[PDB]
Write a protein that holds these residues in place. Structure first.
Motif, PDB file in Angstrom:
ATOM      1  N   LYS A 130       0.605  -1.580  -0.139  1.00  0.00           N
ATOM      2  CA  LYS A 130       0.017   0.171  -0.049  1.00  0.00           C
ATOM      3  C   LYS A 130       0.993   0.652   0.212  1.00  0.00           C
ATOM      4  O   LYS A 130       1.891   1.056   0.867  1.00  0.00           O
ATOM      5  CB  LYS A 130      -1.169   0.233   0.876  1.00  0.00           C
ATOM      6  CG  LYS A 130      -1.894   0.754   1.016  1.00  0.00           C
ATOM      7  CD  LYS A 130      -3.198   1.231   2.929  1.00  0.00           C
ATOM      8  CE  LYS A 130      -3.609   2.359   2.578  1.00  0.00           C
ATOM      9  NZ  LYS A 130      -4.564   2.455   3.380  1.00  0.00           N
ATOM     10  N   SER A 131       0.676   2.288  -1.423  1.00  0.00           N
ATOM     11  CA  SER A 131       1.146   3.613  -1.157  1.00  0.00           C
ATOM     12  C   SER A 131       0.538   4.382  -1.528  1.00  0.00           C
ATOM     13  O   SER A 131      -0.231   4.343  -2.032  1.00  0.00           O
ATOM     14  CB  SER A 131       2.428   3.148  -2.305  1.00  0.00           C
ATOM     15  OG  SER A 131       3.455   4.119  -1.583  1.00  0.00           O
ATOM     16  N   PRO A 132       0.527   5.837  -0.615  1.00  0.00           N
ATOM     17  CA  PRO A 132      -0.538   6.861  -1.361  1.00  0.00           C
ATOM     18  C   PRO A 132       0.195   7.227  -2.481  1.00  0.00           C
ATOM     19  O   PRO A 132      -0.849   7.624  -3.166  1.00  0.00           O
ATOM     20  CB  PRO A 132       0.766   7.300  -0.342  1.00  0.00           C
ATOM     21  CG  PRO A 132       1.290   7.581   0.905  1.00  0.00           C
ATOM     22  CD  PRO A 132       1.747   5.684   0.487  1.00  0.00           C
ATOM     23  N   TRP A 133       1.450   7.277  -3.105  1.00  0.00           N
ATOM     24  CA  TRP A 133       1.241   7.584  -4.704  1.00  0.00           C
ATOM     25  C   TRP A 133       0.826   6.054  -5.318  1.00  0.00           C
ATOM     26  O   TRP A 133       1.449   4.607  -4.891  1.00  0.00           O
ATOM     27  CB  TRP A 133       2.857   7.386  -4.766  1.00  0.00           C
ATOM     28  CG  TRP A 133       2.947   8.821  -4.076  1.00  0.00           C
ATOM     29  CD1 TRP A 133       3.667   8.923  -3.339  1.00  0.00           C
ATOM     30  CD2 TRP A 133       3.519  10.506  -5.281  1.00  0.00           C
ATOM     31  NE1 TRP A 133       4.478  10.256  -3.022  1.00  0.00           N
ATOM     32  CE2 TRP A 133       3.922  11.314  -3.812  1.00  0.00           C
ATOM     33  CE3 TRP A 133       3.152  10.591  -5.406  1.00  0.00           C
ATOM     34  CZ2 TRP A 133       4.149  12.354  -3.833  1.00  0.00           C
ATOM     35  CZ3 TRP A 133       1.965  12.109  -6.199  1.00  0.00           C
ATOM     36  CH2 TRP A 133       4.068  12.803  -5.275  1.00  0.00           C
ATOM     37  N   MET A 134       0.003   6.203  -6.569  1.00  0.00           N
ATOM     38  CA  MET A 134      -0.268   5.578  -6.883  1.00  0.00           C
ATOM     39  C   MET A 134       0.985   5.180  -8.315  1.00  0.00           C
ATOM     40  O   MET A 134       1.645   5.915  -8.927  1.00  0.00           O
ATOM     41  CB  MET A 134      -1.113   6.462  -8.325  1.00  0.00           C
ATOM     42  CG  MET A 134      -2.563   6.517  -7.484  1.00  0.00           C
ATOM     43  SD  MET A 134      -4.455   6.579  -8.456  1.00  0.00           S
ATOM     44  CE  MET A 134      -3.769   8.493  -9.014  1.00  0.00           C
ATOM     45  N   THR A 177       0.612  10.543 -13.903  1.00  0.00           N
ATOM     46  CA  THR A 177       0.017  10.664 -13.691  1.00  0.00           C
ATOM     47  C   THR A 177      -1.191  11.223 -15.195  1.00  0.00           C
ATOM     48  O   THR A 177      -2.052  11.055 -15.268  1.00  0.00           O
ATOM     49  CB  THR A 177       0.579  12.805 -13.840  1.00  0.00           C
ATOM     50  OG1 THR A 177       0.892  12.573 -12.345  1.00  0.00           O
ATOM     51  CG2 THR A 177      -1.184  14.104 -13.442  1.00  0.00           C
ATOM     52  N   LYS A 195       0.932  20.443  -9.374  1.00  0.00           N
ATOM     53  CA  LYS A 195       1.547  19.299  -8.612  1.00  0.00           C
ATOM     54  C   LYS A 195       2.862  19.104  -8.805  1.00  0.00           C
ATOM     55  O   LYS A 195       3.637  20.101  -9.630  1.00  0.00           O
ATOM     56  CB  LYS A 195       0.851  18.431  -8.144  1.00  0.00           C
ATOM     57  CG  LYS A 195      -0.309  17.890  -8.046  1.00  0.00           C
ATOM     58  CD  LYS A 195      -1.004  19.141  -6.908  1.00  0.00           C
ATOM     59  CE  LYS A 195      -1.953  18.165  -6.422  1.00  0.00           C
ATOM     60  NZ  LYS A 195      -2.801  19.090  -4.751  1.00  0.00           N
TER      61      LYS A 195
END
Length: 73
Positions: free
Chosen positions: A5-9, A13, A72
């Motif tokens: 599990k990681s916040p960054w996909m 983008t 971003k």
């Protein structure tokens, strides 16, 4: 190690923008092309050409517009 599990996909983008605007089945082909691109079995120009064909200009413009309004970094 398994299904991390990681916040960054993991997907980029650009892909994320198209993914939210395209069918999952369609993304399967896009993802397959991406693997070919990574394996250097596909030319970058060919990838963009195929990507444009898959997403459509009407979607590419939307993606480009979204990227333009993407403060971003």
């Amino acid at each position: 190690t398994t299904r991390p599990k990681s916040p960054w996909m993991p997907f980029p983008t650009l892909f994320a923008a198209i993914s939210h605007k395209v069918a999952e089945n369609d993304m399967l082909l896009i993802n397959a092309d991406y693997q070919q691109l990574r394996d250097k079995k596909m030319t970058r120009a060919e990838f963009v050409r195929k990507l444009r064909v898959i997403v459509g200009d009407d979607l590419l413009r939307s993606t480009i517009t979204t990227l333009q309004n993407q403060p971003k970094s």
